[PDB]
């Protein structure tokens, strides 16, 4: 039961619905936390089951428009020439957030012989305290950094002490099951934030 503490000046967990103009989910998506814990350590043998995301900073939205482009980078086209393909995307980011993501990994079927739960456990522990990662944990949008450190039990005050804002259904680990190696397709498996009592009790499927 690893206890990573995401922290970042500025977070953006785009709501699926208003993805076009970022509404960053009020908290981190268990899908995002999944990807961060992948970022610290993900060999294909491990799927990160996120146990308990805890809010560590009060939800503080801040709005910024990134004068963003809106055509995926297409092979055949020679360049994107943004000025033609421009879409000023607004964003209701989260600002200065930290998340105590009580988390775990499970061994995938693609475990291999060298697949000790303790092996990857220790490896991730080292990657965290040593502050390693595959990619600097993207805090909802890789343009926004993360500052992680494997806490042991509890080393940051959590703001939403009393039972706080039900954020409604949001994005869980966006299912890769229907996909071949490296997520060809998917199905966004919405879950419920039912009671962010203090730390949202992310439910495994």
């Amino acid at each position: 039961r690893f206890i990573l503490e995401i922290s970042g000046d500025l977070a953006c967990f785009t709501r699926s619905e208003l993805k076009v103009e970022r509404v960053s989910y009020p908290v981190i998506t268990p899908s995002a936390a999944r990807n961060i814990l992948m970022a610290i350590l993900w060999k294909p043998a491990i799927r990160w089951k996120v146990l308990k995301i805890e809010i560590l900073k009060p939800i503080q939205w801040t709005n910024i428009r990134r004068n963003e482009v809106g055509t995926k980078m297409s092979e055949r086209s020679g360049s994107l020439y943004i000025e033609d393909n421009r879409q000023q995307r607004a964003s209701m980011l989260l600002k200065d957030v930290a998340y105590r993501i009580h988390a775990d990994f499970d061994m995938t079927s693609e475990a291999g012989e060298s697949d000790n739960y303790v092996k990857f456990a220790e490896m991730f522990k080292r990657r965290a305290k040593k502050g390693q990662y595959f990619h600097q944990p993207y805090l909802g949008c890789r343009e926004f950094p993360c500052d992680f450190r494997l806490l042991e039990k509890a080393e940051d005050g959590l703001p939403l002490e009393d039972i706080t804002q039900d954020f409604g259904f949001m994005l869980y680990d966006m299912d890769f099951s229907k996909s071949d190696p490296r997520d060809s397709n998917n199905a966004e498996p919405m879950f419920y934030q039912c009671k962010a009592v203090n730390g949202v009790i992310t439910v495994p499927p």
Partner: protein, 70 residues
Amino acid sequence: MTSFYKITAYNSQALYFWGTDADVDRYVDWLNRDREINVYAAEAIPEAEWAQYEGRDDVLSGEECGWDDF
């Protein structure tokens, strides 16, 4: 003569439009009510590409209400 019309301006959110050429010109004017610079410009989408922008909800149509925004 009704066409899918792309409406572009320097570093501006493209605005796709469907209707007559006079229609798109009037919609351009509405976009250019205040834009002393970065005046939205109308471009005729090539016919073959039409089905692509078709469906895209970000298009104004040559239906009656496509002109109530004034």
